[PDB]
Tab-separated table of C-alpha atoms in Angstrom:
chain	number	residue	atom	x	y	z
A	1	UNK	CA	46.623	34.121	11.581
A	2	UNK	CA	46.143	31.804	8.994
A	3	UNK	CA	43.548	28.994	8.572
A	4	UNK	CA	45.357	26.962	6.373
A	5	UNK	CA	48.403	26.737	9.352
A	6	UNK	CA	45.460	25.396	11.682
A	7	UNK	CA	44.430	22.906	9.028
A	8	UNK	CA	47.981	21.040	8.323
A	9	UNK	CA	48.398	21.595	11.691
A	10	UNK	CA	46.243	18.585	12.414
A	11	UNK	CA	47.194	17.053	9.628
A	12	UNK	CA	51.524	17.106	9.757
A	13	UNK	CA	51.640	17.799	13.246
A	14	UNK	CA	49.484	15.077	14.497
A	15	UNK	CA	51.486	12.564	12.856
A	16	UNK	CA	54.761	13.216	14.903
A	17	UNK	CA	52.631	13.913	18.230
């Protein structure tokens, strides 16, 4: 969808993981 979701989405979403 967008690349931008899959970027902060190792970047936010790996920090609570």
């Amino acid at each position: 969808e967008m690349r931008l979701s899959k970027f902060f989405r190792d970047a936010i979403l790996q920090r609570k993981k």
